[PDB]
Design an enzyme around this catalytic site. Structure first.
Site, mmCIF file in Angstrom:
data_model
loop_
_atom_site.group_PDB
_atom_site.id
_atom_site.type_symbol
_atom_site.label_atom_id
_atom_site.label_comp_id
_atom_site.label_asym_id
_atom_site.label_seq_id
_atom_site.Cartn_x
_atom_site.Cartn_y
_atom_site.Cartn_z
ATOM 1 N N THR B 44 0.829 -1.194 0.000
ATOM 2 C CA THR B 44 0.000 0.000 0.000
ATOM 3 C C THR B 44 0.870 1.254 0.000
ATOM 4 O OG1 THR B 44 -1.565 -1.250 1.319
ATOM 5 C CG2 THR B 44 -1.911 1.121 1.178
ATOM 6 N N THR B 45 1.874 1.278 0.861
ATOM 7 C CA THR B 45 2.758 2.425 0.942
ATOM 8 C C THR B 45 3.533 2.641 -0.359
ATOM 9 O OG1 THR B 45 2.940 2.072 3.308
ATOM 10 C CG2 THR B 45 4.614 3.486 2.271
ATOM 11 N N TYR B 107 -13.215 -3.718 -1.227
ATOM 12 C CA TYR B 107 -14.370 -3.305 -2.014
ATOM 13 C C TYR B 107 -15.497 -4.319 -2.229
ATOM 14 C CZ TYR B 107 -17.172 -1.147 -5.698
ATOM 15 O OH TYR B 107 -18.213 -0.666 -6.446
ATOM 16 N N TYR B 133 -3.108 -9.850 5.536
ATOM 17 C CA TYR B 133 -3.044 -8.432 5.854
ATOM 18 C C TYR B 133 -4.448 -7.870 6.023
ATOM 19 C CZ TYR B 133 -2.060 -3.410 4.779
ATOM 20 O OH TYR B 133 -2.005 -2.035 4.776
ATOM 21 N N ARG B 138 -9.712 0.296 5.160
ATOM 22 C CA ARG B 138 -9.448 0.504 3.740
ATOM 23 C C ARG B 138 -10.217 -0.467 2.851
ATOM 24 N NH1 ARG B 138 -4.810 3.202 1.776
ATOM 25 N NH2 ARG B 138 -3.395 4.012 3.387
ATOM 26 N N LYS B 161 -0.510 -9.522 9.008
ATOM 27 C CA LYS B 161 -0.247 -8.132 9.301
ATOM 28 C C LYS B 161 -1.542 -7.581 9.872
ATOM 29 C CE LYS B 161 0.838 -3.667 7.224
ATOM 30 N NZ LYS B 161 1.225 -2.921 6.010
ATOM 31 N N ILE B 203 5.529 -4.143 10.050
ATOM 32 C CA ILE B 203 5.575 -3.786 8.646
ATOM 33 C C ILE B 203 5.195 -2.326 8.740
ATOM 34 C CG2 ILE B 203 4.600 -4.216 6.349
ATOM 35 C CD1 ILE B 203 4.212 -7.079 7.276
#
Ligand SMILES: N[C@@H](CCCC[NH3+])C(=O)O
Lengths: 291, 291
Positions: B44-45, B107, B133, B138, B161, B203
């Site tokens: 994501t980052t 989503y 994760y 999100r 995560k 992380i």
């Protein structure tokens, strides 16, 4: 200008998950015969997420071909990448889609300015009517009434699917805008009320299994007939509730299977409606006279 | 089993959006030098959602090339399509990645059972250590501790995560897992606390700007030296909060730019850090001795 019952149509699938073209074809024909005012092809209910880009195109093309200009077709073309949204919306246009429905970028949580820049960029890149689509629960972002109001200034941004189900806020949105752009309901259970307050239609999940009933509910609510909108909705209000006993489109696809219209195909990570809800659903369908 | 400071590395971009390969090379080098224990490529980052599939492959390829086996590389390969995730995870495997990090499908809201089947299917299709994760804010979906415990039975599901930032909940997760899979923090503000509780690492987003510091914080917390982990984390605590004034990676990219390591590039719908935030960030960076 596009109004009434807009079905967010499932993408029928074979047992193996392959797109079932013959069922898709029959569904479209049926929706047109039943009163449905238009179809959103490959939206959330149509499993946009699990179909390849090639399949998005194929599905959009088949629905347009079968509709044969009788009702307008909206292509679901949202993405959480501005560049990719531009590509998908361009493809929808070249395919002759009448409009494109674009969910706010999901997962990467852009700022309001980013949502603004995202939509503006698409609108300037493709010359096609664009409909915004806000559904915070799924995406991680909430496109504010203020931001939607700013976007309504762009000529080809013609509407917004408000799936919040927050009637007061939807009314506030309707009023803040003027016929600057349309407002469509994305929440079947409060849709009738939204249309009575001025929404131009309902991009429905329930219209998948009750196209005529919803067709009528929209006509009446848009005409501001509160009492008949209420009693015509009460007949299918239960459907609005059970079609989300598990995440859409799981329930509606099983419903359509119990109706003999489509097969059980459904793509991971989505799963066939859990055994636990099949019977209560069969009963909900009977109680409403669907079967 | 990977342990320690695991940087969720940004993918540096030139003003026009193109990946800044040179800066990336320098960052990977710097992390290894500073004490970073592992790198997560294109998570994501790293703006995984706005990079082309080819850029995806290329970033992993470059990070692996530069790292030169000095530290384990984790490739971000999550998708909201099970078919898609397998494809991305096979790719990462063939590229030489040591493990893959897969965020829960976002989503489309799969069920708990759908989440279990999604991850199980990927595990069986690709022989590579997989790290789950969960970041509900999100994705629109929350992988329960129960579903995690289930998945931890699978041989190559080696970790999770946990980005909830809910430490008591993380305590319950660590406890219910009985060591079957590792737990990593996905929340910089509370990471030292989760590690003191038994988490194998962090992380981290903050590790992007303070890799030496986050590396010691991790080692000391994993060693369960509560006093030293608290005072070490206190020195960089303001960073964990500031790096999220807007949605990650918007702030960390700007921080890194103020540090003179990367350019201003970031891809829509994401936007460069809003003006109002740039100075406060510069100051936090100054107080922490980074700048
Ligand atoms: N990855 C982080 C960044 C968001 C930044 C919030 N302002 C998260 O899921 O919350």
């Amino acid at each position: 200008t596009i109004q009434g019952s807009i079905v967010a149509i499932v993408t029928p699938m074979l047992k193996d998950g392959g797109v079932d073209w013959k069922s898709l074809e029959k569904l479209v024909e049926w929706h047109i015969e039943q009163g449905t005012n238009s179809i959103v092809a490959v939206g959330t209910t149509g499993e946009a997420s699990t179909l390849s880009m090639e399949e998005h195109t194929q599905v959009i093309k088949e629905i347009i071909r079968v509709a044969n200009k009788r009702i307008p077709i909206i292509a679901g073309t949202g993405a959480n990448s501005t560049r990719e949204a531009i590509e998908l919306t361009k493809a929808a246009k070249d395919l002759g889609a009448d409009a494109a429905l674009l969910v706010t970028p999901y997962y990467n949580k852009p700022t309001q300015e980013g949502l603004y820049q995202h939509y503006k960029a698409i609108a300037e890149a493709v010359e096609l009517p664009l409909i915004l689509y806000n559904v915070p629960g799924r995406t991680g972002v909430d496109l504010s009434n203020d931001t939607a109001v700013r976007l309504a200034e762009i000529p080809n941004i013609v509407g917004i699917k408000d799936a919040t189900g927050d009637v007061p806020r939807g009314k506030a949105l309707i009023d803040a805008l003027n016929g600057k752009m349309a407002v469509y309901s994305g929440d079947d259970e409060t849709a009738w009320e939204l249309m009575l307050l001025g929404a131009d239609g309902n991009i429905s999940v329930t219209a998948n299994i009750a196209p005529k009933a919803m067709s009528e509910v929209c006509a009446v609510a848009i005409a501001k007939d509160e009492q008949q909108a209420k009693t015509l909705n009460n007949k299918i209000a239960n459907l609005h509730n059970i079609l989300f006993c598990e995440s859409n489109p799981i329930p509606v696809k099983w419903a359509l299977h119990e109706m003999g219209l489509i097969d059980t195909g459904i793509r991971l990570p989505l799963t066939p409606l859990a055994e636990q809800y099949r019977e209560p659903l069969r009963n909900a369908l009977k109680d409403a006279g669907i079967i």
